[PDB]
Amino acid sequence: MIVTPASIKALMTSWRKDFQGGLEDAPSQYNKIAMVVNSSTRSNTYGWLGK
Amino acid sequence: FPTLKEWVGKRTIQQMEAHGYSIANKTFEGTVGISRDDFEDDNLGIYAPIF
Numbered sequence: 001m002i003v004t005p006a007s008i009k010a011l012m013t014s015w016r017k018d019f020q021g022g023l024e025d026a027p028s029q030y031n032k033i034a035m036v037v038n039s040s041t042r043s044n045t046y047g048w049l050g051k
Numbered sequence: 052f053p054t055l056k057e058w059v060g061k062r063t064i065q066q067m068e069a070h071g072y073s074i075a076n077k078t079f080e081g082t083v084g085i086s087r088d089d090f091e092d093d094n095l096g097i098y099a100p101i102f
Contacts, residue, residue: 047095047097048097049097049098
């Protein structure tokens with residue numbers, strides 16, 4: 001039996017990438033309650049007329 | 052018509068009635084006014100839906 005040191009025995013591992021994405025984020029569900037509007041300048045102004 | 056009842060002597064002449072009811076109609080009004088200048092120089096389009 002060859003008495004190898006501790007560091008050499010610790011280097012004798014194989015790298016596996018099964019844990020790559022970590023834990024996935026929660027589902028996205030903001031489109032159900034919000035209205036999406038695109039702005040083109042410094043700010044948007046909205047205006048409506050009373051009855 | 053009155054309800055039929057047992058006949059003993061001679062017919063007893065009875066009475067009916069009549070009713071009436073009248074509904075009188077009324078006149079309703081609504082008016083708004085805006086300046087001519089304010090209407091004409093309206094590029095936004097906020098005063099369009101008044102009609």
